Amino acid sequence: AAIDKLVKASHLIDMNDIIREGNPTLRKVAEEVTFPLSEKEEILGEKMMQFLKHSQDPIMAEKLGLRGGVGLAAPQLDISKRIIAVLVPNVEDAQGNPPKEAYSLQEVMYNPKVVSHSVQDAALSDGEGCLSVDREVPGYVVRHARVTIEYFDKTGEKHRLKLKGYNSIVVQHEIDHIDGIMFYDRINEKNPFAVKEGLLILE
Ligand SMILES: [Zn+2]
Ligand SMILES: [Zn+2]
Ligand SMILES: [Zn+2]
Ligand SMILES: [Zn+2]
Ligand SMILES: [Zn+2]
Ligand SMILES: [Zn+2]
Ligand SMILES: [Zn+2]
Ligand SMILES: [Zn+2]
């Protein structure tokens, strides 16, 4: 089955593993994982993080035919489990100095969920994209500005985390996937660029 192919030691995740808009797995509510994790579930998380590392690496992205990304959910690999990986890099300064921290967020999250959020909404100015969606989709994807999430790591340790800005948006977008929600579900149906007063537009 799909998970068996993905977790083979020599197997690298690429675009051929990513299912496409229309595939029913994208619309399911993914199943919670139980702890302790199976070896498959642990390796799957590791492969998913590796895929994001590769997508952000100039050489490996070219070798594998990948395009940059910051998040991946297991349903996108045809695996209906509540597993996501997020990897959001910090950026060099104007002088070309690497940041203090390589990443502002780097986690493989098991059973993640939003436990509370701000009343205020936010949206990326440039909209959102998706590896499973081979269409141009304009518009503000309206999300919570700030969230508090809970999730478990591969060890079963529970974490509780507050997020805002871009990382809030990235997380979620990935949580949506494990609930069978697609980004364009959160775009205004009649005017993609409608702005309800108070919306935080993120640059
Ligand atoms: Zn493959
Ligand atoms: Zn391991
Ligand atoms: Zn590598
Ligand atoms: Zn709680
Ligand atoms: Zn609420
Ligand atoms: Zn996505
Ligand atoms: Zn919500
Ligand atoms: Zn629509």
Residue numbers in the entry: 2 to 204
From the paper:
PDFs are ubiquitous essential metalloenzymes which co-translationally remove the formyl group carried by the initiator methionine in bacteria, mitochondria and chloroplast. In addition, SaPDF contains the typical insertions of type 2 PDFs12, including an eight-amino acids loop folded as an α-helix (insertion 2) and a long loop connecting strands β2 and β3 usually referred as the CD-loop (insertion 3).
The apo-protein crystallized in two different crystallization conditions, which gave highly similar structures (root mean square deviation between all Cα is 0.307 Å). According to this measure, both free SaPDF crystallized in a slightly open conformation (δap measured between C131, H178 and V71 is respectively 48.0° and 47.5°). The structure is organized into two sub-domains around the active site, called N- and C-terminal sub-domains.
